Enzyme design. Structure first.
Site, mmCIF file in Angstrom:
data_model
loop_
_atom_site.group_PDB
_atom_site.id
_atom_site.type_symbol
_atom_site.label_atom_id
_atom_site.label_comp_id
_atom_site.label_asym_id
_atom_site.label_seq_id
_atom_site.Cartn_x
_atom_site.Cartn_y
_atom_site.Cartn_z
ATOM 1 N N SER B 242 -15.879 13.502 2.959
ATOM 2 C CA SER B 242 -16.381 14.841 2.691
ATOM 3 C C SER B 242 -15.308 15.852 2.929
ATOM 4 C CB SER B 242 -17.692 15.173 3.316
ATOM 5 O OG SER B 242 -17.626 15.091 4.725
ATOM 6 N N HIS B 272 -20.698 6.776 3.807
ATOM 7 C CA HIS B 272 -20.377 8.035 4.519
ATOM 8 C C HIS B 272 -21.670 8.569 5.140
ATOM 9 C CE1 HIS B 272 -18.216 11.423 5.881
ATOM 10 N NE2 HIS B 272 -17.992 12.041 4.718
ATOM 11 N N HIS B 318 -16.345 2.019 11.862
ATOM 12 C CA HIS B 318 -15.659 3.275 11.579
ATOM 13 C C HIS B 318 -14.270 3.071 11.002
ATOM 14 C CE1 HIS B 318 -14.532 7.603 12.065
ATOM 15 N NE2 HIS B 318 -15.850 7.777 11.905
ATOM 16 N N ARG B 327 -20.217 11.057 19.629
ATOM 17 C CA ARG B 327 -21.350 11.765 19.030
ATOM 18 C C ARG B 327 -22.557 10.852 19.203
ATOM 19 N NH1 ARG B 327 -18.990 12.676 13.134
ATOM 20 N NH2 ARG B 327 -18.559 10.482 13.554
ATOM 21 N N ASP B 373 -24.212 8.084 12.903
ATOM 22 C CA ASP B 373 -25.405 7.851 12.126
ATOM 23 C C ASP B 373 -26.425 6.879 12.701
ATOM 24 O OD1 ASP B 373 -24.363 9.541 9.999
ATOM 25 O OD2 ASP B 373 -23.034 7.873 9.508
ATOM 26 N N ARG B 399 -21.727 20.122 8.212
ATOM 27 C CA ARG B 399 -20.369 19.864 7.697
ATOM 28 C C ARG B 399 -19.663 21.078 7.097
ATOM 29 N NH1 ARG B 399 -17.485 15.077 8.146
ATOM 30 N NH2 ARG B 399 -18.434 15.216 10.218
ATOM 31 N N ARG B 419 -1.468 16.027 -4.531
ATOM 32 C CA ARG B 419 -1.226 15.208 -5.674
ATOM 33 C C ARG B 419 -0.213 14.112 -5.309
ATOM 34 N NH1 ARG B 419 -0.172 11.637 -9.740
ATOM 35 N NH2 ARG B 419 -0.639 12.429 -11.830
HETATM 36 C C1 LIG Z 1 -17.496 2.969 8.300
HETATM 37 C C2 LIG Z 1 -16.927 1.860 7.370
HETATM 38 C C3 LIG Z 1 -16.995 2.302 5.877
HETATM 39 C C4 LIG Z 1 -15.455 1.733 7.717
HETATM 40 O O1 LIG Z 1 -14.821 0.928 6.727
HETATM 41 P P1 LIG Z 1 -13.393 0.179 6.998
HETATM 42 O O2 LIG Z 1 -12.466 1.028 7.784
HETATM 43 O O3 LIG Z 1 -12.972 -0.311 5.680
HETATM 44 O O4 LIG Z 1 -13.944 -0.965 7.965
HETATM 45 P P2 LIG Z 1 -13.158 -2.233 8.470
HETATM 46 O O5 LIG Z 1 -11.669 -2.196 8.376
HETATM 47 O O6 LIG Z 1 -13.751 -2.511 9.787
HETATM 48 O O7 LIG Z 1 -13.677 -3.298 7.401
HETATM 49 C C5 LIG Z 1 -13.264 -4.680 7.619
HETATM 50 C C6 LIG Z 1 -14.340 -5.546 7.018
HETATM 51 O O8 LIG Z 1 -15.497 -5.460 7.889
HETATM 52 C C7 LIG Z 1 -16.680 -5.172 7.185
HETATM 53 N N1 LIG Z 1 -17.563 -4.318 7.943
HETATM 54 C C8 LIG Z 1 -17.153 -3.176 8.599
HETATM 55 N N2 LIG Z 1 -18.165 -2.507 9.121
HETATM 56 C C9 LIG Z 1 -19.302 -3.240 8.766
HETATM 57 C C10 LIG Z 1 -20.692 -3.097 9.019
HETATM 58 N N3 LIG Z 1 -21.252 -2.100 9.634
HETATM 59 N N4 LIG Z 1 -21.551 -4.008 8.526
HETATM 60 C C11 LIG Z 1 -21.034 -5.030 7.839
HETATM 61 N N5 LIG Z 1 -19.760 -5.294 7.529
HETATM 62 C C12 LIG Z 1 -18.941 -4.359 8.052
HETATM 63 C C13 LIG Z 1 -16.082 -4.255 6.089
HETATM 64 O O9 LIG Z 1 -16.988 -3.927 5.034
HETATM 65 C C14 LIG Z 1 -14.876 -5.077 5.655
HETATM 66 O O10 LIG Z 1 -15.348 -6.253 4.980
HETATM 67 P P3 LIG Z 1 -14.570 -6.736 3.623
HETATM 68 O O11 LIG Z 1 -13.259 -7.204 4.166
HETATM 69 O O12 LIG Z 1 -15.271 -7.923 3.062
HETATM 70 O O13 LIG Z 1 -14.361 -5.522 2.777
HETATM 71 C C15 LIG Z 1 -17.559 0.465 7.633
HETATM 72 O O14 LIG Z 1 -17.493 0.341 9.070
HETATM 73 C C16 LIG Z 1 -19.023 0.411 7.191
HETATM 74 O O15 LIG Z 1 -19.339 0.045 6.059
HETATM 75 N N6 LIG Z 1 -19.962 0.775 8.065
HETATM 76 C C17 LIG Z 1 -21.394 0.746 7.679
HETATM 77 C C18 LIG Z 1 -21.755 2.061 6.981
HETATM 78 C C19 LIG Z 1 -21.739 3.287 7.890
HETATM 79 O O16 LIG Z 1 -22.283 3.216 9.016
HETATM 80 N N7 LIG Z 1 -21.203 4.458 7.382
HETATM 81 C C20 LIG Z 1 -21.209 5.656 8.213
HETATM 82 C C21 LIG Z 1 -19.970 5.893 9.048
HETATM 83 C C22 LIG Z 1 -19.623 7.319 9.541
HETATM 84 F F1 LIG Z 1 -20.189 7.561 10.774
HETATM 85 C C23 LIG Z 1 -19.950 8.392 8.541
HETATM 86 O O17 LIG Z 1 -21.151 8.891 8.632
HETATM 87 O O18 LIG Z 1 -19.140 8.788 7.737
HETATM 88 O O1 LIG Z 2 -14.508 10.207 10.324
HETATM 89 C C1 LIG Z 2 -14.899 9.650 9.287
HETATM 90 O O2 LIG Z 2 -14.182 8.959 8.493
HETATM 91 C C2 LIG Z 2 -16.374 9.741 8.977
HETATM 92 C C3 LIG Z 2 -17.191 10.379 10.064
HETATM 93 O O3 LIG Z 2 -17.529 9.851 11.127
HETATM 94 C C4 LIG Z 2 -17.524 11.827 9.700
HETATM 95 O O4 LIG Z 2 -17.102 12.301 8.635
HETATM 96 O O5 LIG Z 2 -18.252 12.488 10.521
HETATM 97 O O1 LIG Z 3 -1.168 14.516 -13.674
HETATM 98 C C1 LIG Z 3 -1.627 15.477 -13.038
HETATM 99 O O2 LIG Z 3 -1.417 15.727 -11.807
HETATM 100 C C2 LIG Z 3 -2.454 16.476 -13.811
HETATM 101 C C3 LIG Z 3 -2.477 16.236 -15.294
HETATM 102 O O3 LIG Z 3 -1.568 16.494 -16.089
HETATM 103 C C4 LIG Z 3 -3.790 15.569 -15.705
HETATM 104 O O4 LIG Z 3 -4.633 15.294 -14.838
HETATM 105 O O5 LIG Z 3 -3.969 15.337 -16.952
#
Ligand SMILES: CC(C)(COP(=O)(O)OP(=O)(O)OC[C@H]1O[C@@H](n2cnc3c(N)ncnc32)[C@H](O)[C@@H]1OP(=O)(O)O)[C@@H](O)C(=O)NCCC(=O)NCC[C@H](F)C(=O)O
Ligand SMILES: O=C([O-])CC(=O)C(=O)O
Ligand SMILES: O=C([O-])CC(=O)C(=O)O
Ligand SMILES: CC(C)(COP(=O)(O)OP(=O)(O)OC[C@H]1O[C@@H](n2cnc3c(N)ncnc32)[C@H](O)[C@@H]1OP(=O)(O)O)[C@@H](O)C(=O)NCCC(=O)NCC[C@H](F)C(=O)O
Lengths: 435, 435
Positions: B242, B272, B318, B327, B373, B399, B419
């Site tokens: 976001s 997210h 995360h 949090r 969450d 947010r 970019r």
């Molecule tokens: C937050 C998120 C996207 C982080 O992703 P990323 O940094 O890529 O996690 P990791 O490096 O730990 O991922 C390694 C592997 O573990 C898996 N994994 C990580 N968290 C997991 C979970 N909660 N449940 C299941 N599998 C999970 C990943 O999906 C990935 O598997 P893959 O190799 O087959 O792709 C991941 O932990 C997730 O999917 N969590 C569940 C969804 C969630 O709770 N989102 C909200 C988070 C935050 F608070 C927000 O609101 O933004």
């Molecule tokens: O930090 C992040 O990537 C996601 C998260 O917990 C938030 O946006 O509040």
């Molecule tokens: O390439 C860029 O950064 C922008 C541009 O010309 C396009 O999106 O078509």
């Protein structure tokens, strides 16, 4: 017989394997470094993402799956009696990496005609929008509202296993591309041809032709222009604002409608796609202040006044290109062939001889050459599409082709959440010592 | 007497100078390297952006301008007779870097009450939306539609010199924060309290209180919960989906309404902010399959079934945090104080004892701890807000505080277009040799 989805089912597992082994051998290999200036500078120069559909060379311009624009013009199927490539064919190329047959191209055309249908809630919203709401905002809000029809959002909610994400993204992609022209045309009609109707889709025509008929244009050269326009504005690698935005939003698992609408809000910025509108508004004030046939010394004065007032000259410069944009050249060539004597075209030609020199003189721009936006609206105006605030919408419609083609691949390959680390100026000073 | 805009006018030039000299000395200093795996991995681990308002530590969690949550709880002004920090105060801190006085806090409150007003076209659109259109999509489309009121878009069109961009972004920021609650409340009423009205703003109350009155809640503890909720969900550094999305879109000069709406489409992704909704839906199927009081062995079975089906367990893991989200802890503490015997809370408590262990056993997640969450919706449900598809909207409203605070700074400091360069797998293999 033809079925892109079956083609993709064979391609996917092979690319998965290939990437898997590569990363096995080189995942830890360093491809670059990050400096303080790159962090402060909007990541300029940082190799930060993988995007398969197109790659831009700073000197040569864009390549779509390996092919340059002249190559696509030559290789892609054309309409019967046409000269310009059909965007349907460009989509097949981006998605499969192979030049399609005309047979395959017509399948795309029928599929897109088959899927074009708008839900009533979207129709009502458009019809209720005020005329002072910019066309791009009208577009982005309608795409957002279409998400109630998302097949991906629906499967996600049902608990589909992650390995099948691509199948649903593909469906929403083809449905969204199908609907785009109807949404864009409804806005055009509502704002500029109040009381008329876009009509219906003819399953027998190419996507550009149904689009131009819905906009209400009859000129056959105009249909040709549309085909070229929509093909060239399709993709520009992954780091451009619009594409990076769809990539990043899609990375969170947001559906393709949500991802593309967010991309559109980025394309509406003045430093991105809105520059196509900005160029025409700048030209119009130009011809207004100076009046139609200007001397070079007066044009120079006018450019300087913009620069001196803390504004940019629209249509010039680029974050990556270091030479004249081949999309600009491709447009110039079309003009020379079809509207060589147009006065606005002549003005655009004249500025090519002056603006780069003034920008160089000023010494701030890294690229003093024109970009695609400097030559697009000139072509539009010549055929009667003089509503300049609507220009970016056509760019939006073309952009869907590239971003949606990559989106399918991102999910097919399992790309994860885009989430880099940020730093504060204080924290960064400490990391180094300070300054 | 108090005027944040005057405060910012003094701060801006000093920060500009400080950054200027720093980059003079260290712009070329390298802060990291980029590897193949980071490119394929959604930039995980790459230091890619400058974001001033908050910085996240992987072990300690988030700091707002240097202060942790416990510190803000303690230092920020509270409502008369309150215990939870007012989000108005958190906004002042993010924007100026200084802890505000209660006097300054009430000025924010009045300013926001003064600026809350919706244009009729937005009201009509909301009222015409169908009930199956998700609340987040309703939210993003309405914010997009509000752009017709953009003061920044307007000044930009008039040719304002770039040095003044921040002044107009500040105005649109304060107007957008002001309006958010009215938009969000109208959606809540339309969808769940059909035929009723949000009412009017009381210039004498804090922003959270007017918001809860518009949602229709009377419970005073609920107002306290809202104040805490809105403060903690405010910002989380710059690389989260976001915030990065608002940063990138804003970098193109798109107005704050367009930038924030695109941010919302990213917050609506399941990976997210939509996870706050997902956690409640998962818990509801849980209690449904297993029925209210489950044994630990049954809870384990249930987690495994999700994992085995190719799905994620929502609310855990995360991209950056490596330990339990503060949090989450802050929310647990609120529960222990106010609804210690709630059965859902009890379930959430029980899962803390089991999920991390199962995730560790599975060996894929890097962080097996809960995130914000996992504990938010539990608190909401207890007070009667049981509409789980609406939860992410509250996160969206909070947010806005952080992203808009940084947005003003991005323009004040002249950050350019975001970019980066993208690469194809083929091009990258060639860059190295292949694999
Ligand atoms: C937050 C998120 C996207 C982080 O992703 P990323 O940094 O890529 O996690 P990791 O490096 O730990 O991922 C390694 C592997 O573990 C898996 N994994 C990580 N968290 C997991 C979970 N909660 N449940 C299941 N599998 C999970 C990943 O999906 C990935 O598997 P893959 O190799 O087959 O792709 C991941 O932990 C997730 O999917 N969590 C569940 C969804 C969630 O709770 N989102 C909200 C988070 C935050 F608070 C927000 O609101 O933004
Ligand atoms: O930090 C992040 O990537 C996601 C998260 O917990 C938030 O946006 O509040
Ligand atoms: O390439 C860029 O950064 C922008 C541009 O010309 C396009 O999106 O078509
Ligand atoms: C395309 C864009 C954003 C690239 O930005 P960036 O990579 O940061 O450019 P540079 O590194 O060359 O910028 C160096 C300096 O030159 C200035 N400059 C660059 N192009 C300029 C132009 N056309 N007019 C005036 N000043 C310009 C920059 O603004 C910057 O000044 P600053 O130091 O005071 O910030 C910049 O060239 C620009 O503003 N162009 C005008 C707007 C435009 O035509 N946008 C459309 C481009 C594209 F085709 C698209 O549609 O996406």
């Amino acid at each position: 017989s033809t079925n892109l989805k079956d083609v993709l089912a064979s391609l996917i597992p092979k690319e998965q394997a290939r990437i898997k082994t590569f990363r096995q051998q080189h995942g830890n290999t360093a491809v670059g470094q990050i400096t303080v200036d790159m962090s402060y500078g909007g990541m300029r120069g940082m190799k930060g993402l993988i995007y398969e559909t197109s790659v831009l060379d700073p000197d040569e311009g864009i390549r779509f799956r390996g092919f340059s624009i002249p190559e696509c013009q030559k290789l892609l199927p054309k309409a019967g009696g046409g000269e310009e490539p059909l965007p349907e064919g460009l989509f097949w190329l981006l998605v499969t990496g192979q030049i399609p047959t005309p047979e395959q191209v017509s399948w795309v055309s029928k599929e897109w005609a088959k899927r074009a249908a708008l839900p009533s809630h979207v129709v009502t919203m458009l019809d209720n929008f005020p005329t002072n709401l910019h066309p791009m905002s009208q577009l982005s809000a309608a795409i957002t509202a279409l998400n109630s029809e998302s097949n991906f959002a629906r499967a996600y909610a049902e608990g589909i296993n992650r390995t099948k994400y691509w199948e649903f993204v593909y469906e929403d992609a083809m449905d969204l591309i199908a609907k785009l022209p109807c949404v864009a045309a409804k806005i055009y009609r509502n704002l500029y041809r109040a009381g008329s109707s876009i009509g219906a889709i003819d399953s027998k025509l190419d996507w550009s032709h149904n689009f131009t008929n819905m906009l209400g244009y009859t000129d056959p050269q105009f249909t040709e222009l549309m085909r070229l326009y929509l093909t060239i504005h399709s993709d520009h690698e992954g780091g451009n604002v619009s594409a990076h935005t769809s990539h990043l939003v899609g990375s969170a698992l947001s559906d393709p409608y949500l991802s593309f609408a967010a991309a559109m809000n980025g394309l509406a910025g003045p430093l991105h796609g809105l520059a196509n509108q900005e160029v025409l508004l700048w030209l119009s004030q130009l011809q207004k202040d100076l009046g139609a046939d200007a001397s070079d010394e007066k044009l120079r004065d006018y450019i300087w006044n913009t620069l001196n007032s803390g504004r940019v000259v629209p249509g010039y410069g680029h974050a990556v290109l270091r030479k004249t944009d081949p999309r600009y050249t491709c447009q110039r060539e079309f003009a020379l062939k079809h509207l060589p004597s147009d006065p606005m075209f002549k003005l655009v030609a004249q500025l090519y001889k002056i603006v780069p020199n003034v920008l160089l003189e000023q010494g701030k721009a890294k690229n003093p050459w024109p970009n695609v936006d400097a030559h697009s609206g000139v072509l539009l105006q010549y055929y009667g599409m003089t509503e300049m605030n609507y220009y970016t919408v056509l760019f939006g419609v073309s952009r869907a082709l590239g971003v949606l083609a990559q989106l399918i691949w991102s999910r097919a390959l399992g790309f994860p959440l885009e989430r880099p680390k940020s730093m504060s100026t204080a924290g960064l000073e400490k990391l180094s010592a300070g300054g």
